[PDB]
RNA sequence: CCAAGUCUGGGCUAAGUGGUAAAGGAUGUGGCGCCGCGAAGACAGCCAGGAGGUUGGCUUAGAAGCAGCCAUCCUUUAAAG
RNA sequence: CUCGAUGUCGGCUCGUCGCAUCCUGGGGCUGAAGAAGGUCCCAAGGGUUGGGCUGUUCGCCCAUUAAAGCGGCACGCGAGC
């Protein structure tokens, strides 16, 4: 899931991961792959 | 309690350099007795902060004058918060202009009553009391709904009985959620 | 919005600061770096709060639909009598006292605003009473 | 696939096989509708009109049924009280109200399957859960 | 106060060469790299990571050379073999010299060439994995073979590392 | 590139921002204020219970947090969901 | 800037760049079982049919297709029709 904007984790445990200048939020639930960078 | 530093260099360029350091301008006032004295913020704040420290005096330590004072004015900073000028008065026996902190309870008979809720209107009372005013004058009434409101009338006065404000003008009242 | 029975046609252009800062319930909603603000939008925030609030404990207010906006034309050319009073809104620029009640107690009143505001048109902020207020 | 587990149920004492709570619940969840049901009869035979609760399983004691235990707080509350279902709304309705003594007492009485045991404890439980319903103290 | 504590048991060859801290144990001459300011000690039974500051780079670095070189150690201690379990009704596995057997997706030729420290343990093969040297690249090749045909969250079958209690999503209507 | 320090001094960025942009997003970086504590010996790691009336409301076909609108008491300690 | 002149539609011939990519491959996501779909992300490679009615570009339809893309240059082109 990509959205060059917003991304505020969600899935309770949902993780905010720095990655190559990219705000890529990672969860153990595929259901949140928050990509915006 | 409170403590400050005298304003030799006073009035303008000073107040500014003041803000600079982290000192905001202040006045020490008593009947026609005044001193342009200056405020060290950080703590000045903590103090004011007590708020109790805003409705009820504290003791000022300037040079070595442990004396009695409260605040009447404060040019508080338009552009955000923090003020631009603090004003205090030192008392003797006769303090009339009294803004005594007033706490109360509509004795929960509103929300868990009509869903309705309570609006604090006055909160404090500027009545009279000779440097002998309670830091918590208070009132109550398990009536917290209907076309219901309560005022200075009913009020319910303490040891220092003196209303320097008006004859009942609504301490506050209850308005409905989406009503009951 | 509201601003019934005016007096005049349409004001004009300017903006710089104002004079609202106090509070009225401790559900503190305060502008910061604006200018105009669409009444409509306003409601937007209004409603936002209104429903977030488990639907009930009724908020307060602040500003007003204030002035009359004109785009005049329709798409035209320009030089007509600049007629048409198409829009209505407030003029708040120096963080103004936008204050409103329910009984959230905490970040729910927070959210409510946070949103309503995010919603509004500008970099702005919110808070609670930190410098009581003395009247006559 | 078959996950064992003692079945905790609230049912129509006097009866035995309440379609929804013992048909599906017991039988499929980890028990049996009508059989646990006639055991039910065996018991509910003299407890059945203020509702009755029992946890029934195939367990130690090498058998089937398990433990019958005081018809849950709030419910036996209205039960002795005097109303059918729930008073539709608790607190914001402040219309169902009971009293001190008769309360603490009924407490004492139902006291069996009661955590620890204390006069004030059971009474308080009454006032409280009763409220939970609309069975408020007044 | 901690991001530096590691012993060097067994007469493991633990020494500084050309910016490379050489860690030789069971023939594995693991290279635990050396950054300019890091630096450590080889004393009696303890090897210690030191720090010429403590900002983000240096502190992280500390954690690094410390733990990675640690790796050089335990590694040289044994030799590093990666424990993996393949398991699929539609799957097979057998060494055959220097090669990955494997087949879970018909047309079977899943012939490999195990890198180095690597070799294949075909104990089942429902139980079957890899053996290496340097703890590190064995994990990588391991994951290699893992992924090449592996997953299946809705119906299992693949190659499962340990097998982390693999999750799975329903089917159609039932 | 062409004149004149690849001056000295104390920061702060590491993206090449410098070589246009906002609303807005964030364990980016570096600077200051309150809240719990490592001797009521900390946090993540980790063990173990995963408390009893809780399973109170319309809708219960099912709310008995893990439907939704009304609660927010009690029992009782490892503690208190 | 243009009126001591910058020939304004459509089509034709010739095109040439852009991606916000129709088709293509590469993808995570699914309310994905397969097959096939919908949903973003990556990327211009090449590819991107014939008729009808209309001076129409556009459009509606006939038959196709893997696809039958959108759009820049005076809505490219009269010193080339």
Swiss-Prot record, chain A:
GO terms for molecular function: metal ion binding; structural constituent of ribosome. Zn(2+) binds at residues 11, 14, 27, 32. GO terms for cellular component: cytoplasm; ribonucleoprotein complex; ribosome. Keywords: Metal-binding, Ribonucleoprotein, Ribosomal protein, Zinc. PANTHER family: 50S RIBOSOMAL PROTEIN L36, CHLOROPLASTIC, LARGE RIBOSOMAL SUBUNIT PROTEIN BL36C. Part of the 50S ribosomal subunit. This is Large ribosomal subunit protein bL36. The gene is rpmJ.
Swiss-Prot record, chain B:
SUPFAM superfamilies: Ribosomal protein L25-like. GO terms for biological process: translation. Belongs to the bacterial ribosomal protein bL25 family. CTC subfamily. This is one of 3 proteins that mediate the attachment of the 5S rRNA onto the large ribosomal subunit. Part of the 50S ribosomal subunit. Contacts the 5S rRNA; has been isolated in a complex with 5S rRNA and uL5, 5S rRNA and DNA binding protein II; 5S rRNA and uL18; 5S rRNA, uL5 and DNA binding protein II. Pfam families: Ribosomal_L25p (PF01386), Ribosomal_TL5_C (PF14693). InterPro entries: Rbsml_bL25/Gln-tRNA_synth_N, Ribosomal_bL25/Gln-tRNA_synth, Ribosomal_bL25_b-dom, Ribosomal_bL25_C, Ribosomal_bL25_long, Ribosomal_L25_dom, Ribosomal_uL5_bac-type. Gene3D superfamilies: Ribosomal protein L25, beta domain, Ribosomal Protein L25, Chain P. The keyword Ribonucleoprotein applies. One of its GO terms (cellular component) is cytosolic large ribosomal subunit. Keywords: Ribonucleoprotein, Ribosomal protein, RNA-binding, rRNA-binding. The keyword rRNA-binding applies. It comes from the Bacteria. GO terms for molecular function: 5S rRNA binding; structural constituent of ribosome. The lineage of its organism: Bacteria, Thermotogati, Deinococcota, Deinococci, Thermales. This is Large ribosomal subunit protein bL25.
UniProtKB/Swiss-Prot annotation, chain D:
GO terms for cellular component: cytosolic large ribosomal subunit. One or more lysine residues are methylated. It comes from the Bacteria. InterPro entries: Ribosomal_uL11, Ribosomal_uL11_bac-typ, Ribosomal_uL11_C, Ribosomal_uL11_C_sf, Ribosomal_uL11_CS, Ribosomal_uL11_N, Ribosomal_uL11_N_sf. One of its GO terms (molecular function) is large ribosomal subunit rRNA binding. Forms part of the ribosomal stalk which helps the ribosome interact with GTP-bound translation factors. Belongs to the universal ribosomal protein uL11 family. This is Large ribosomal subunit protein uL11. It comes from Thermus thermophilus.
From Swiss-Prot, chain E:
Keywords: Ribonucleoprotein, Ribosomal protein, RNA-binding, rRNA-binding. GO terms for biological process: cytoplasmic translation. It comes from the Bacteria. Coiled coil: none annotated. It holds the Pfam family Ribosomal_L6. Gene3D superfamilies: Ribosomal protein L6, alpha-beta domain (3.90.930.12). GO terms for cellular component: cytosolic large ribosomal subunit. GO terms for molecular function: rRNA binding; structural constituent of ribosome. Part of the 50S ribosomal subunit. This protein binds to the 23S rRNA, and is important in its secondary structure. It is located near the subunit interface in the base of the L7/L12 stalk, and near the tRNA binding site of the peptidyltransferase center. Belongs to the universal ribosomal protein uL6 family. HAMAP family: Ribosomal_uL6_B. This is Large ribosomal subunit protein uL6.
């Amino acid at each position: 899931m990509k959205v060059r904007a917003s991304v505020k984790r969600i899935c309770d445990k949902c993780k905010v991961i720095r990655r190559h200048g990219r705000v890529y939020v990672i969860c153990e639930n595929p259901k949140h792959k928050q990509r915006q960078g | 309690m409170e403590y400050r530093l005298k304003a030799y260099y006073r009035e303008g360029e000073k107040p500014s350099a003041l803000r600079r350091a982290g000192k905001l301008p202040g006045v020490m006032y008593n009947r026609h007795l005044n001193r342009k004295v200056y405020v060290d913020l950080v703590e000045f704040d903590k103090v004011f902060r007590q708020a109790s420290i805003h409705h009820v005096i504290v003791l000022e330590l300037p040079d070595g004058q442990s004396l009695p004072t409260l605040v009447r004015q404060v040019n508080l900073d338009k552009r955000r918060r923090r003020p631009e000028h603090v004003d205090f008065f030192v008392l003797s026996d006769e303090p009339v202009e009294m803004y005594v902190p007033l706490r109360f309870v509509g004795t929960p008979a509103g929300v868990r009553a009509g869903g309705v809720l309570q609006e604090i209107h006055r909160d404090i009372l500027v009545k009279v009391s000779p440097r002998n005013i309670p830091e918590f004058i208070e009132v109550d009434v398990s009536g917290l709904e209907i076309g219901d409101s309560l005022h200075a009338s009913d009020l319910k006065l303490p040891p220092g009985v003196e209303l320097a404000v008006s004859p009942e003008e609504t301490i506050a009242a209850v308005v409905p959620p989406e009503d009951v | 919005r509201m601003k019934y029975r005016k007096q005049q046609r349409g004001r004009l252009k300017g903006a710089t600061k104002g004079g609202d800062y106090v509070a009225f319930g401790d559900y503190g909603l305060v502008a910061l770096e604006p200018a105009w603000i669409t009444a409509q939008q306003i409601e937007a925030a209004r409603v936002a709060m209104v429903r977030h609030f488990r639907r009930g404990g009724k908020i307060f207010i602040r500003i007003f639909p204030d002035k009359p906006y004109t785009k005049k034309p329709l798409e035209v050319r320009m030089g007509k009598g600049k007629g048409n009073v198409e829009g209505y809104v407030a003029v708040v620029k120096p963080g103004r006292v936008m204050f409103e009640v329910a009984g959230v107690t905490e970040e729910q009143a927070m959210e409510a605003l946070r949103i309503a505001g995010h919603k509004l048109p500008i970099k702005t902020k919110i808070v609670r009473r930190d410098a009581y207020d003395e009247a006559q | 696939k078959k996950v064992v587990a003692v079945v905790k149920l609230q049912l129509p004492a006097g009866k035995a096989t309440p379609a929804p709570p013992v048909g599906p619940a017991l039988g499929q969840h980890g028990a049996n509708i009508m059989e646990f049901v006639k055991a039910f009869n065996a018991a509910t035979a003299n407890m059945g009109d203020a509702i009755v609760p029992v946890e029934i399983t195939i367990y130690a004691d090498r058998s089937f049924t398990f433990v019958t235990k005081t018809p849950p707080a709030s419910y036996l509350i209205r039960k002795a009280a005097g109303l059918e279902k729930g008073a539709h709304k608790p607190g914001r309705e402040k219309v169902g109200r009971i009293t001190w003594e008769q309360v603490l007492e009924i407490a004492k009485q139902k006291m069996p399957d009661l955590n620890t045991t204390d006069l004030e404890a059971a009474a308080r439980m009454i006032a409280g859960s009763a409220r939970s319903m609309g069975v408020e103290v007044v | 106060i901690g991001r530096l504590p590691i012993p060097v048991p067994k007469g493991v060859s633990v020494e500084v060469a050309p910016g490379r801290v050489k860690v030789k144990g069971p023939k594995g001459e693991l290279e635990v790299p050396v950054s300019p300011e890091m630096r450590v000690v080889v004393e009696e039974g303890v090897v210690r990571v030191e720090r010429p500051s403590d900002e983000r780079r240096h502190k992280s670095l500390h954690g690094l050379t410390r733990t990675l070189i640690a790796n050089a150690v335990k590694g040289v201690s044994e030799g590093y073999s990666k424990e993996l379990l393949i398991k699929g009704i539609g799957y097979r596995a057998r060494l055959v010299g220097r090669a990955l057997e494997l087949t879970v997706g018909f047309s079977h030729p899943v012939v490999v060439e195990p890198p180095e420290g690597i070799t294949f343990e075909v104990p089942e093969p429902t139980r079957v994995r890899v053996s290496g040297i340097d703890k590190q690249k064995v994990g990588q090749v391991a994951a290699n073979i893992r992924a090449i045909r592996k997953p299946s969250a809705y119906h299992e079958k693949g190659i499962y590392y340990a097998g982390e209690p693999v999750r799975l999503k329903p089917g159609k209507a039932g």
